[PDB]
């Protein structure tokens, strides 16, 4: 029932929808939207579970 409310359908369209929430007002690109999702939880330097 959550997949009905999802406006995205693929991966690159979904990475834009995180950019429009995290950095709103700035138009997103391909390589700028890919590096933002990686830098949230999947980088050693900007995430630590300790």
């Amino acid at each position: 029932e959550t997949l009905r409310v999802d406006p995205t359908n693929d991966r690159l369209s979904a990475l834009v929808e995180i950019y429009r929430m995290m950095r709103p007002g700035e138009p997103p690109t391909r390589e700028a939207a890919e590096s933002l999702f990686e830098n949230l939880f999947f980088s050693e330097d900007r995430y630590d579970l300790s």
């Binding site: 929430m21 709103p24 007002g25 700035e26 138009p27």
Partner: peptide, 25 residues
């Protein structure tokens, strides 16, 4: 054609209020 991509953004913005975003745009 890099100005029609702003009209794809400007009517659909997340209402930015930071002037550094508006200048770098």
């Amino acid at each position: 054609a890099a100005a029609q991509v702003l009209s794809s953004v400007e009517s659909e913005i997340g209402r930015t209020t930071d002037p550094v975003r508006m200048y770098m745009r």
